[PDB]
Amino acid sequence: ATQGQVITCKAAVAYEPNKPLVIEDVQVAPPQAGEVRIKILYTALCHTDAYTWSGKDPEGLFPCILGHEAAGIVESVGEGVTEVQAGDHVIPCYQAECRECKFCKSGKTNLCGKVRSATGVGIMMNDRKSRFSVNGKPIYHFMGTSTFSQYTVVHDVSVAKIDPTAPLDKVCLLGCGVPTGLGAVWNTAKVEPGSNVAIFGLGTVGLAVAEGAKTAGASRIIGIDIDSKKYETAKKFGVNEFVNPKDHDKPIQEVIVDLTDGGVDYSFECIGNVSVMRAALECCHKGWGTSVIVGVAASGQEISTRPFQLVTGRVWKGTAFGGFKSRTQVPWLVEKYMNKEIKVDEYITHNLTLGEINKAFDLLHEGTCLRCVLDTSK
């Protein structure tokens, strides 16, 4: 019986950047109007969590509870919440879908600005305060989700209600990395059957691009990485050719153009390296090739090219959460998963507990790690 009451539970707190996370007993306040309190059962670590932890984000607010890929069960809801109720199985999402703002109503984008003025600064809309504290001191939320915790509080416009038979230690991946890569292909690029595709970076997101391209009927799916072992792992996701830039004196974009007689029809940058973003554009075919930025670059870094690349017909764009509408389409992706129409399981290479989260951070520097999933019960 926890409705209307503070909950005390375990969470990993980041007190300062580039230092080990601390497991604490934190207090989680009840949900206010338009809010959902969620019992988080499984959560995965994403490089975006490490971006802010590693001090690379000048907007980083500390102390905070990181985490944004997760799945769990609603414990209670606040005033006026009707789309979910206690007991529902849910995926909290960094990308909200309010269906009422200028962006939601435009029909032109999947962005939503309803709760950005709070979630971007680690607080809640209804009272401009945080629902987390430890030893009497408030803690910042992160990305509107804060899932490295046994319980979190999120805005209702960011909660997807999913099939209650779907295994929660698998579908936690569908809150970020996998939909970002799939939708880069299906929504942003709109890749046609028979297309030639290049994928720069063969981590989780690049492998989901490969799956999206394979599902859509692409012909050549060329992976580019400096770690050739990543190619062996990538084969089951659809990568069917590989180039290591270190094997060639010519710049990688020229090697790709030579290999495809002119360049690829689509390219995808999945690392967040601006120098690789330039190479990805320049390897696109003259007259029509399109390059999609998928990885998130570090603050202040700029992409560059000579404008004749665009004047002679290449197109530069990018994707946020693969162009998907979270509350409407994340449940559809869970349906497809349950039908064996999209891969999820194969991305999960490690399973740890929340108490071992610092070991999970260490696995981010392991090439064989794609996604580590953490059980929050221990």
- Determine, following the binding rule CB under 8 A, whether residue 8 of this chain makes contact with a second copy: no
Among 9, 320, 338, 352, binds a second copy (CB under 8 A): 320
**Is 202 annotated for ligand binding?**
yes
Q: Which two tokens stand for residue 158?
A: 């960011």
Q: Amino acid identity of 133? A: S
Query: Would you mind telling me the total number of residues written for the chain in this entry?
Result: 378
Is 93 a known active-site residue? no
**Is 293 annotated for ligand binding?**
no
Residue 349: count of CB within 10 angstroms of its CB? 15
Q: Which two tokens stand for residue 192?
A: 């046609």
Q: Amino acid identity of 158? A: S
Among 1, 165, 249, 302, binds a second copy (CB under 8 A): 302
Judged by CB, which is closer to a second copy: 19, or 102? Answer: 102
Q: CB under 5 to 8 A by kind: which of a second copy, Zn ion, none does 98 bind?
A: Zn ion
Residue 203: count of CB within 10 angstroms of its CB? 24
Among 46, 209, 256, 277, binds a second copy (CB under 8 A): 277
107 conformational bin, left if phi > 0, alpha if psi -120 to 50, beta if neither: left
**Is 350 annotated for ligand binding?**
no
Among 56, 102, 129, 359, binds a second copy (CB under 8 A): 102
Judged by CB, which is closer to a second copy: 167, or 313? Answer: 313
Stretch that binds a second copy, among 35-43, 80-88, 213-221, 291-299 (CB under 8 A): 291-299
Is 290 a known active-site residue? no
Burial 149-184 (b: 16+ CB within 10 A, else e): bbbbbbbbbbbbbbeeebebbbbbbbbbbbbbbbbb
**Is 226 annotated for ligand binding?**
no
Judged by CB, which is closer to Zn ion: 46, or 330? Answer: 46
Q: How far is the CB of 306 from a second copy (least distance, A)?
A: 6
As a dihedral over the C-alpha atoms of residue 363, residue 221, residue 68, residue 47, rounded to 10 degrees, the angle is: 40
Exposed, middle or buried by CB within 10 Å (0-12, 13-18, 19+), for 57? middle
Cβ-contact 214, 237 below 8 angstroms: yes
Q: Which two tokens stand for residue 288?
A: 């029509």
Among 305, 349, 351, 358, binds a second copy (CB under 8 A): 305
Is 369 a known active-site residue? no
Q: Which residues fall within 8 angstroms of residue 254, CB to CB, at 6 or more apart?
A: none
- Determine, following the binding rule CB under 8 A, whether residue 194 of this chain makes contact with a second copy: no
Among 1, 135, 249, 306, binds a second copy (CB under 8 A): 306
Q: CB under 5 to 8 A by kind: which of Zn ion, a second copy, none does 250 bind?
A: none
Among residues 72, 3, 84, the alpha carbon closest in space to that of 36 is found at 84
Q: Which two tokens stand for residue 56?
A: 């690379």
- Determine, following the binding rule CB under 8 A, whether residue 328 of this chain makes contact with a second copy: no
Enzyme catalytic residues = 46-48, 68-69, 98, 101, 104, 112, 116, 176, 371
Residues near a second copy (CB under 8 A) are: 102-103, 106, 108-109, 111, 262, 274, 277, 286-288, 293, 296-297, 300-320
- Residues annotated within a binding site for NAD(+): 47, 201-206, 225, 230, 271, 294-296, 319-321, 371
